[PDB]
Amino acid sequence: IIQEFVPGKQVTLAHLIAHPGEELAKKIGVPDAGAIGIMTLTPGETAMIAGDLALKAADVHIGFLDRFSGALVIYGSVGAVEEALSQTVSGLGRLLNYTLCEMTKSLEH
Amino acid sequence: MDKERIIQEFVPGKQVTLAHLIAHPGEELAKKIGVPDAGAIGIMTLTPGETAMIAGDLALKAADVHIGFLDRFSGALVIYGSVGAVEEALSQTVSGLGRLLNYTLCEMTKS
Amino acid sequence: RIIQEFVPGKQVTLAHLIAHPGEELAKKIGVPDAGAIGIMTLTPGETAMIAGDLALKAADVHIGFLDRFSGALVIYGSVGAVEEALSQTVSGLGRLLNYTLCEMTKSLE
Amino acid sequence: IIQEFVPGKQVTLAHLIAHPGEELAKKIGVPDAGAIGIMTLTPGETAMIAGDLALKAADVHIGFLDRFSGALVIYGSVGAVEEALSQTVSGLGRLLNYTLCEMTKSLEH
Amino acid sequence: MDKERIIQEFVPGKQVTLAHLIAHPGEELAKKIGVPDAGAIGIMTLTPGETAMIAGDLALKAADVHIGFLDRFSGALVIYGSVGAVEEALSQTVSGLGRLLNYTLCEMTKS
Amino acid sequence: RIIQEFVPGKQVTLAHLIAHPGEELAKKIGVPDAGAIGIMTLTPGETAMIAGDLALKAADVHIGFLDRFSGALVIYGSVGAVEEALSQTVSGLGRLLNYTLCEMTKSLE
Ligand SMILES: [Cl-]
Ligand SMILES: [Cl-]
């Protein structure tokens, strides 16, 4: 039989990369910051909503925001990126009842 | 052994997944989204994706908003204007899709 | 484990008769102040033109809305004409093209 | 468990509309021709391949060709559109092993 | 009763579905596809869609072809050039995706 | 009948060690004439940067290829370094982020 589909509302991951470094940062065209934070979101348009939440949560900036894939990549100090990721995931839960993920981190060194 | 392949038919459901008002997006976010800075940006996700065209027309007729972009393949509709205008456009677009085309609807949400 | 090869289904998802919409509702929908309005949705969306042709060939109706890709068709005319157009279009899509079909629905105020 | 997916190669329909008429033709932005032929194809890029096969099969022209949906809409005389549809479906089968459909028609009147 | 909703995880397979040479497309078709008239147009479909970027780079390095368009969301790659160049680019792109990235491959086909 | 709400899975689909590629193969791939090349593919594609960081943090490797969206990562360095980077990256994606994992594969000529 025909299967009917719609997008789910999900944060697939929300990951803090501490001190990614020059090589990695250049490859993805983001500043060589203290941290880069990456979120994968469904539907893809969520990246626009998440970008707003991140910017208002902490002193971070947007590396890139892609409505197609749903990727949101932010950068700034390690503490600011951690706070922005945490508040963005929690806000998507509170405002829009997203299925959430745990905040994960890759430490410096 | 290679995985078995099976042909599967799929149809999109008729659903508005997001209808969200971003109040006071700021310059950085507006530039990254790729629309002019405005009082508000409205974000909709439509399934089937092609409903974005009808949704854009409903939005324009409801209030003094502008189309940022409309993507019939991904199902995105992004509008901008005043907070009040964007709110009204989102509300009336969702209502219209429900009333006239029997869409499953989401709540109108706001940041 | 299997690999699913995705292909589109053919489905009529709405086939609705609005008997005597009246001046205000006709204006809202964007059609003349007709005896009836008929609203159909189907997928694939580009096949709305197929439904449009079947409706026109079936009865003395006119097209209020049809485009290339939306999968929505709005027709208008007398109640009998719109009823016949909807009935023959749904039946035709099922018989000729093996669409999965919804029930006809109607509103009268 | 995670479901893995890829596109299938399918002609979902291949439909000849004889004498669609001014109203329908204007709505879809195609000339008011003797016939309009519509094919739905997966993957969507197939519409580009099908367009070539149709144009070389008969004296038809392309109304529109959409790589996103996979729609191919052609126009011309009833006989030319019938031949182009028939040869396009058969060619996709021979050249690319597409899953095919039956050719369908909506008659004049 | 409303239909039950179930969240389902999906992943794209790694597959080249089409790698097709359109010889002598003609002016009408080239215009509708939206590329210059050339001796040939090459059409590829990639899954995951994002592989279109790597595929375009493989194509350019293999032969004197040009990118018509490359769509990382739909998985489309459309190239153009001489029949010989397009044939070589399609062949080497498919081969490279298989050899280096373990893609499931289609046959190189031609009209 | 059910409505499926689609969300992306997390999967590592290739994790391959090429020991002593040699001058010609290194040039073909586009990296220095290193002791080893490591090739990974994963989805969602934008998460290649996560793998890149884990690889760099794990061992003395360099990134030959990484971009924003492709889901492909190429690293290079000594055989031991590339082996360690691949092993720790695959393990890390599984443990930290609950990716579904493939087996490590290797080629030596
Ligand atoms: Cl910083
Ligand atoms: Cl004609």
DSSP class per residue in D41-102: EESTTHHHHHHHHHHHHSSEEEEEE-TTT-EEEEEE-HHHHHHHHHHHHHHHHHHH-PBP--
In sign, the C-alpha dihedral spanning F23, F25, F26, F30 is: positive
- Resolution for this experimental structure (Å): 1.6
Closest chain C CA to residue A1: C9
Number of C-beta neighbours around residue C35 at 10 A: 16
Beta strand D103-106 with D71-76: parallel, antiparallel or unpaired?
A: unpaired
Closest chain F CA to residue D1: F9
Distance between Cα F33 and ligand 1 center (Å): 34
Q: How far apart are CA A50 and CA A41, in angstroms?
A: 9
* Joined tokens for residue C44: 């694939």
Q: How far apart are CA B65 and CA B33, in angstroms?
A: 16
Distance between Cα C48 and ligand 2 center (Å): 21
Q: How far apart are CA C17 and CA C59, in angstroms?
A: 14
Closest partner residue to E48 among F5, F29, F43, by Cβ? F43
- Give C96's contacts (C-beta < 8 A, 6+ positions apart): D104, D106
The region, left, alpha or beta by phi > 0 then psi within -120 to 50, assigned to residue F97 is alpha
Number of C-beta neighbours around residue F80 at 10 A: 12
Residue contact E22–D49, C-beta within 8 A: yes
Q: How far apart are CA C62 and CA C47, in angstroms?
A: 17
Closest partner residue to F70 among E8, E11, E51, by Cβ? E51
**Are D71 and D42 contacting, i.e. CB atoms less than 8 angstroms apart?**
no
**Are B97 and B104 contacting, i.e. CB atoms less than 8 angstroms apart?**
no
Kindly list the residues from chain D whose CB atom is less than 8 angstroms away from the CB atom of residue C52.
24, 27
Range 51-110 of E in CB contact (< 8 A) with F? 51, 53-54, 72, 100-102
Kindly list the residues from chain B whose CB atom is less than 8 angstroms away from the CB atom of residue D10.
7
**Are B44 and B55 contacting, i.e. CB atoms less than 8 angstroms apart?**
yes
Q: How far apart are CA A64 and CA A73, in angstroms?
A: 5
Kindly list the residues from chain E whose CB atom is less than 8 angstroms away from the CB atom of residue B73.
73-74
Residue contact F46–A99, C-beta within 8 A: no
Report the residue of A48, A75, A90 to disrupt the B interface, i.e. the one with the largest count of B CBs within 10 Å. A48
In sign, the C-alpha dihedral spanning E21, E24, E25, E30 is: positive
Closest chain D CA to residue F101: D2
Indicate which ligand has the atom closest to the C-alpha of D80: 2
Residue entry with tokens 């996709």: D92
**Are B67 and B56 contacting, i.e. CB atoms less than 8 angstroms apart?**
yes
- Residues with a beta carbon under 5 angstroms from ion ligand 2: D 33-34
Kindly list the residues from chain D whose CB atom is less than 8 angstroms away from the CB atom of residue B50.
69
Closest partner residue to B76 among A9, A45, A55, by Cβ? A45
Residue contact B22–A52, C-beta within 8 A: yes
Closest partner residue to E6 among F2, F29, F45, by Cβ? F2
Kindly list the residues from chain C whose CB atom is less than 8 angstroms away from the CB atom of residue B3.
1-3
Residue entry with tokens 């009408």: E28
Residue contact B74–A44, C-beta within 8 A: yes
Burial class (CB in 10 A: 0-12, 13-18, 19+), A61: middle
Render the burial of B90-105: b for 16+ CB within 10 Å, e for the rest.
bbebbebbeebbbbbb
Closest chain E CA to residue D56: E25
Number of C-beta neighbours around residue C88 at 10 A: 16
Helix, strand or coil, per DSSP, at residue C62: strand
In the structure, how many helices (H) and strands (E) does chain C have? 3, 6
Q: How far apart are CA C74 and CA E37, in angstroms?
A: 39
Q: Do chains D and A touch (3 or more CB pairs under 8 A)?
A: no
Residue contact F97–A15, C-beta within 8 A: yes
Helix, strand or coil, per DSSP, at residue E32: helix
**Alpha-carbon distance values, D28 to C53, D74, D99, E6 (Å):** 12, 12, 27, 37
Number of cross-chain residue pairs from D and F with Cβ atoms under 8 Å apart: 3
User: Which residue from A75, A24, A77 is spatially nearest to F56, judged by alpha carbons?
Assistant: A24
Beta-bridge partners for F17:
F38, F106
In sign, the C-alpha dihedral spanning F16, F20, F23, F25 is: negative
Report the residue of A1, A2, A4, A6 to disrupt the C interface, i.e. the one with the largest count of C CBs within 10 Å. A2
Q: How far apart are CA F29 and CA E96, in angstroms?
A: 10
B58 CA: distance to closest CA in chain E (Å): 27
Q: How far apart are CA D7 and CA E16, in angstroms?
A: 10
Q: How far apart are CA F24 and CA B11, in angstroms?
A: 48
User: Which residue from E7, E18, E8 is spatially nearest to E74, judged by alpha carbons?
Assistant: E18
In sign, the C-alpha dihedral spanning A18, A19, A20, A25 is: positive
Closest partner residue to A99 among E3, E7, E72, by Cβ? E7
Closest chain E CA to residue A66: E73
Indicate which ligand has the atom closest to the C-alpha of A81: 1
* Joined tokens for residue D105: 């028609």
Backbone angles phi, psi at D24, to 5 degrees: -65, -45
Q: How far apart are CA A60 and CA A81, in angstroms?
A: 6
Helix, strand or coil, per DSSP, at residue E50: helix
Residue contact D71–C68, C-beta within 8 A: yes
Q: How far apart are CA B95 and CA B16, in angstroms?
A: 10
A17 CA: distance to closest CA in chain B (Å): 22
Q: In this structure, which amino acid lies at residue A64?
A: F
Chain centroid, CA C65 distance in Å: 10
* Joined tokens for residue C96: 């000729």
User: Which residue from E34, E7, E37 is spatially nearest to E24, judged by alpha carbons?
Assistant: E37
SS3 readout for F38-101: EEEEEECHHHHHHHHHHHHHHCCEEEEECCCCCCEEEEEECHHHHHHHHHHHHHHHHHHHCCEC
Domains of chain A, earliest start first: 1-109 (3.30.70.1710)
Residue contact B43–A44, C-beta within 8 A: no
In the structure, how many helices (H) and strands (E) does chain F have? 3, 6
Distance between Cα D28 and ligand 2 center (Å): 16
Kindly list the residues from chain A whose CB atom is less than 8 angstroms away from the CB atom of residue B11.
2-5
